[PDB]
């Protein structure tokens, strides 16, 4: 009767109950196995707690499930340890990347019905749920998490598949890049553990400059853009232009040797791959979702940059909701708890008839 919503990201799982405002559980998307052979595996917070006596793996790479055995542990842990349910008692809504290969969609469906025996399930595109969470059905989503960044133009609830842009540059790369440039300053972060500290520096003190060159002037003329930060050991470090050089990577991917144009231009590119007759709607409904879109100043920077590329009188609006670390989960919660959605579920009777390929018929 109460549906479940599981949003599986490259870095973080967001899981919960349909009709709730927030995921009940947010935890790292990792499976740990003992270094010597207490349990055969561990997932999430617990894998992290015991990191030092385990070997940690990420089953999802750039938003795509690649380690199916480890993914099954994550799903089992989600049902039994985080949500404390029996999966056979609950319709389960899952999420996926844009352009998720067909065989992955089937395998997700196969595992849910055959291994977890769910009475019903559904899978939706993440960016599409973010748009749904801002109360819109037409728009272009910039979805940027830990592993992957997409531009996703959507018309009336469905992605325009020919117009989707994928870019393999997201939060984990920005943490690695911020690790790289704090070495210029004298400091030293290289291990898994040191990387996590740099993730926290990134999250607290980074921001997107409105104009990058004006910000580089102001930083190297004075120290009014310098902030201090305290390492777990006790050393107090100072960072300046690293604050905005790190996320400048999104708008200038050549900062980490990558060839792609920046998120602003990929937005334009994606809009331009669509028909002119919905372009006004696309420009006026630019929704950011994902943790990597949380940098202060990024809405205003994106507003400026798209305005310079768009026709001069085009109406441009960036929608950056406070809750956008979880917009994807929220979209799924609203979708799945809706009265009108209860015909949309792939039922177990439907799966038994048509096998895993049913998902193509019922989930776009």
């Amino acid at each position: 009767t109460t549906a479940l919503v599981c949003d599986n990201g490259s870095g973080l799982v967001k899981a919960g109950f349909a009709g709730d405002d927030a995921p009940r559980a947010v935890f790292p998307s990792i499976v740990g196995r003992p270094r010597h052979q207490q349990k055969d595996s561990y997932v999430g917070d617990e894998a992290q707690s015991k990191r030092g006596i385990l070997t940690l793996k990420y089953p999802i790479e750039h938003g795509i499930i690649t380690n199916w055995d480890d993914m099954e542990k994550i799903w089992h842990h989600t049902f039994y340890n985080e949500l404390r349910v029996a999966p056979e008692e609950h319709p389960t809504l899952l999420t996926e990347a844009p352009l998720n290969p067909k065989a992955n969609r089937e395998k997700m469906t196969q595992i849910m019905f055959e291994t977890f025996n769910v009475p019903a399930m559904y899978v939706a595109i993440q960016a599409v749920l973010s748009l749904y969470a801002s109360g819109r059905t037409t728009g272009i989503v910039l979805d940027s998490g830990d592993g992957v960044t997409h531009n996703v133009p959507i018309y009336e609830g469905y992605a325009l598949p020919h117009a989707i842009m994928r870019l393999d540059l997201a939060g984990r790369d920005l943490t690695d890049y911020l690790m790289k440039i704090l070495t210029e300053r004298g400091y030293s972060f290289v291990t898994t553990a040191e990387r996590e500290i740099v993730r926290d520096i990134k999250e607290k003190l980074c921001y997107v400059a409105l104009d990058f060159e004006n910000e580089m002037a102001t930083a190297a003329s004075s120290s009014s853009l310098e902030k201090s930060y305290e390492l777990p050991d006790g050393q107090v470090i100072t960072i300046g232009n690293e604050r905005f050089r790190c996320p400048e990577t999104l708008f200038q991917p050549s900062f980490i040797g990558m060839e792609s144009a920046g998120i602003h231009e990929t937005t334009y590119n994606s809009i331009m791959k669509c028909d002119i007759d919905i372009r006004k709607d696309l420009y006026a409904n630019n929704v950011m979702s994902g943790g990597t879109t949380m940098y202060p100043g990024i809405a205003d920077r994106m507003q400026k940059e798209i305005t310079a590329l768009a026709p001069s009188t085009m109406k441009i609006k960036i929608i950056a909701p406070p809750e956008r670390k979880y917009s994807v989960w929220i979209g799924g919660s609203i979708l799945a708890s809706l009265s009108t959605f209860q015909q949309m579920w792939i039922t177990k009777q439907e799966y038994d008839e048509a096998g895993p390929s049913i998902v193509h018929r019922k989930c776009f």
């Binding site: 018309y155 020919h162 791959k273 028909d275």
Partner: protein, 134 residues
């Protein structure tokens, strides 16, 4: 053209009540048959343009197409099915090549109350059925 083709059309319209009009295009690009409530004759050039479209890496595809004076935005385009939807509520069009990726087509004009993709499984199946018959 034959009684089995008309039987396919009759069956499709019986099973999908939101299918308002049908047209079948032959291997040669011409109209095999179509329902009496519309005529796609004057639009065969853009329809056959879309059916024979094969994009190279950088080429932008057709994003819009007009049939009997209704403008349809393309929202789905594979060799199996192509979906056009009018953005002012005047309906949708499903265009399923015959065979898959081929020059023929089963075309279903859909009532604006339906979601276009709901009719898709049946329409795709009747396009498969028409491979032998054109």
């Amino acid at each position: 053209m034959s009684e089995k083709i008309e039987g396919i059309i009759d069956d499709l319209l019986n099973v999908e009540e939101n299918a308002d009009a049908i047209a079948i295009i032959g291997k040669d690009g011409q109209i095999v048959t179509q329902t009496e409530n519309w005529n796609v004759s004057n639009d065969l050039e853009i329809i056959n343009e879309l059916l024979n479209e094969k994009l190279a890496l950088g080429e932008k595809g057709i994003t819009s197409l007009s049939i009997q004076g209704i403008k349809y935005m393309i929202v789905e385009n594979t060799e199996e099915r192509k979906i056009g939807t009018n953005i002012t509520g005047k309906g949708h069009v499903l265009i399923c090549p015959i065979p898959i990726g081929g020059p023929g087509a089963l075309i279903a004009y859909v009532n604006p109350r339906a979601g276009p993709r709901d009719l898709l499984f049946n329409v795709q199946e009747y396009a498969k059925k028409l491979i032998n018959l054109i």
